[PDB]
Amino acid sequence: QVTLKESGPGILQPSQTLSLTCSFSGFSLSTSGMGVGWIRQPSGEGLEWLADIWWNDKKYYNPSLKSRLTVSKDTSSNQVFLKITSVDTSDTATYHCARRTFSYYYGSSFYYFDNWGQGTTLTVSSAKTTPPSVYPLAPGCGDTTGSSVTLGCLVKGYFPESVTVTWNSGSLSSSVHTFPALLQSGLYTMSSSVTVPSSTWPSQTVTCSVAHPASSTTVDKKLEPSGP
Amino acid sequence: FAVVTQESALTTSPGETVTLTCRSSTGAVTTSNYAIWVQEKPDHLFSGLIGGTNNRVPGVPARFSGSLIGDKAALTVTGAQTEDEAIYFCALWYSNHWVFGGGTKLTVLGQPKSSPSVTLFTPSSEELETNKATLVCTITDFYPGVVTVDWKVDGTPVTQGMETTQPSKQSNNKYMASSYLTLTARAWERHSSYSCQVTHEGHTVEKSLSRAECS
Ligand SMILES: N#Cc1ccc(N/C(=N\CC(=O)O)NC(c2ccccc2)c2ccccc2)cc1
């Protein structure tokens, strides 16, 4: 039952120090061939390896991050640590720790990245908690005609993340497509669209409800037609 | 400091054999680079596949094999299955550090190709009040999950302003994505034609707004 679970702050101000912990189960850094690695996935990007620390205390680092990175193990408590100073905007990503395994088979060496933790997220924003701005996305001209009509809601400029939107149509607010956040400038931005047949709007009342628990504020916006 | 390259996307069908590659910008990939292979499933789910350059991690399906073909490290999946649709990464070792590739979006056709359903929204009056004008262009029900968003104004291209999201999977296992074009209330009122050019499977699906519409 090999398990890995990372722990961190979540949000951070630029310049501050990051402190990640990787608590694990099903193995020990006392035994040979064992070690843990640190990898991060920058939002909208690929993977970027950070550091490796083995049972014999051999540490390996990312060349460009060297001066800011420091990895260390606590075999006693069964956890590994990672400190990253002068954290800035480029450090917002989700951090993962993975079990490193070493095998020396017939002169041949093998190194693996087998078990991975789900991750912990970090947003290095200087911004203070801000409520979301909600704008109704009514259908413009050109294609106002047609079987069904798609409406929407633009949720803008808020911090930190986590916002839930709920649609309320008087018939069939069926096709609801909620889109992921797109952190523009320290504040996020997402969208949600719902689809209803062209005979249930403006007739039936459609309203999108927005919630930002971090700020507790809630917004109800009615979708009204766009005219001349 | 080398650059590791992998294909961006590959499409295959259940029962087929597909090979993905990993190349080093500094020359040939040898056993000394100890190529690794990992798979990324939606919602931050990573699973290790190949170690050494051809050794499998215990527990991994026997259909994943790894080796060196020419100057590159390869990953073959013999008889691809629909649950194999995911993103694959590869890393190489350069004496004292690891460097990951860009990853490959692999699509195993569990249903017929589906074109994108595009919709372009104009700036709301409430937003225009604040001197900002956001354009929201939603794209849904497309498959394979690879698309390309292009914006314009009066027919000429835009090179500053858009931010498209990475395609998410829907319940129907189809993908969706969203792009935004941010302008000022001024730049919006100084042009008449706006379009969202969406490319999927070679073909283009352009949407458009004209500020002279609605009478
Ligand atoms: N991932 C990874 C990785 C880690 C270490 C190595 N190192 C490597 N040699 C050179 C070096 O340490 O600089 N191979 C190592 C090795 C070094 C450190 C930790 C595990 C293995 C080794 C040790 C003992 C017997 C055979 C091989 C190579 C790849």
Measure Cα distances from B209 to A224, B46, B76, B116, B177 in Å.
19, 42, 46, 18, 20
Domain that holds residue B41: 1-110
**What's chain A's length in residues?**
228
If one counts every other C-beta atom within 10 angstroms of the C-beta of residue B116, the result is: 24
Residue B215 located in a structural domain = no
Is B47–A116 a contact, with Cβ atoms under 8 angstroms apart?
Answer: yes
User: In this structure, what are the phi and psi dihedrals at residue A66, rounded to the nearest 5 degrees?
Assistant: -35, -65
Pocket test for ligand 1, best of A50, A100, A102, A104 (most atoms within 8 A of CB): A102
Nearest to B195 by CA among B118, B125, B133, B127: B118
Among B110, B135, B170, residue at a domain's last position: B110
Among A93, A126, A159, residue at a domain's last position: A126
**Residues A121 and A132 occupy one common structural domain:** no
* Deposited resolution, Å: 2.6
Evaluate the CA torsion angle B161, B166, B170, B175 in order and state its sign. Answer: positive
Query: What does the angle CA A21 – CA A25 – CA A30 come to, to the nearest 5 degrees?
Result: 85
* Tokens linked to B12: 């295959």
For chain B, give the secondary structure using H, E and C. Answer: CCCEECCCEEEECCCCEEEEEEEECCECCCHHHCCEEEEEECCCEEEEEEECCCEECCCCCCCEEEEEECCEEEEEEECCCHHHCEEEEEEEECCCCEEECCCEEEEECCCCCECCEEEEECCCHHHHCCCEEEEEEEEEEEECCCCEEEEEECCEECCCCEEECCCEECCCCCEEEEEEEEEEHHHHHCCCEEEEEEEECCEEEEEEEECCCCC
A216 CB contacts (<8 Å, ≥6 apart)?
A: none
**Residues B135 and B82 occupy one common structural domain:** no
Chain B 58-87, residues with CB within 8 Å of chain A CB atoms: none
Torsion-angle region of B63 (φ positive above 0: left; ψ -120 to 50: alpha; else: beta): alpha
Q: How many CA atoms lie within 13 A of A47 on its CB side?
A: 34
Question: How many domains does chain A divide into?
Answer: 2
Asked if B138 contacts A176 with a C-beta cutoff of 8 angstroms, the reply is: no
Chain A residues inside the 8 Å CB shell of B215: 228
**Residues B37 and B116 occupy one common structural domain:** no
Among A77, A101, A126, residue at a domain's last position: A126
**Residues B121 and B192 occupy one common structural domain:** yes
For chain A, give the secondary structure using H, E and C. Answer: CCEEEEECCCEECCCCCEEEEEEEECCCCCCCCEEEEEEEEECCCCCEEEEEEECCCCEEECCCCHHHEEEEEECCCCEEEEEECCCCHHHCEEEEEEEEEEEEECCEEEEEEEEECCCEEEEECCCCCECCEEEEECCCCCCCCCCEEEEEEEEECCECCCCEEEEECCCCCCCCEECCCCCCCCCCEEEEEEEEECCCCCCCCCEEEEEECCCCEEEEEECCCCCC
Nearest to A53 by CA among A36, A67, A40, A66: A36
Nearest to B120 by CA among B147, B150, B146: B150
Among A126, A141, A167, residue at a domain's last position: A126
Shortest distance between the Cα of B109 and any Cα of chain A, in A, equals 23
Nearest CA to ligand 1 atom 22: A109
A75 CB contacts (<8 Å, ≥6 apart)?
A: A28, A29, A30
Q: Which atom of ligand 1 is nearest to the CA of A54?
A: 19
Among B83, B110, B137, residue at a domain's last position: B110
Peptide bond into B58 cis (omega under 30): no
Distance separating alpha carbons of residues A123 and A13, to the nearest angstrom = 8
Asked if B189 contacts B132 with a C-beta cutoff of 8 angstroms, the reply is: no
State the first-to-last Cα distance of chain B, in angstroms, to the nearest integer.
58
If one counts every other C-beta atom within 10 angstroms of the C-beta of residue A54, the result is: 18
Domain that holds residue A29: 1-126
**Residues B23 and B81 occupy one common structural domain:** yes
Alpha carbon B70 to chain centroid, angstroms: 27
CATH number at residue B156: 2.60.40.10
**Residues A149 and A101 occupy one common structural domain:** no
Is A156–B138 a contact, with Cβ atoms under 8 angstroms apart?
Answer: no
Q: CB-based contact (8 Å) between B177 and chain A?
A: yes
B95 CB contacts (<8 Å, ≥6 apart)?
A: none
Find the Cα–Cα–Cα–Cα dihedral B80, B81, B84, B89, rounded to 10°.
-10
**Residues B126 and B57 occupy one common structural domain:** no
**Residues A166 and A211 occupy one common structural domain:** yes
Question: How many domains does chain B divide into?
Answer: 2
Asked if A188 contacts A213 with a C-beta cutoff of 8 angstroms, the reply is: no
Q: How many CA atoms lie within 13 A of A116 on its CB side?
A: 25
User: In this structure, what are the phi and psi dihedrals at residue B147, rounded to the nearest 5 degrees?
Assistant: -140, 170
Experimental method: X-ray
Nearest CA in chain B to A114: B48
Question: What Rg do the C-alpha atoms of chain A give, in angstroms?
Answer: 24
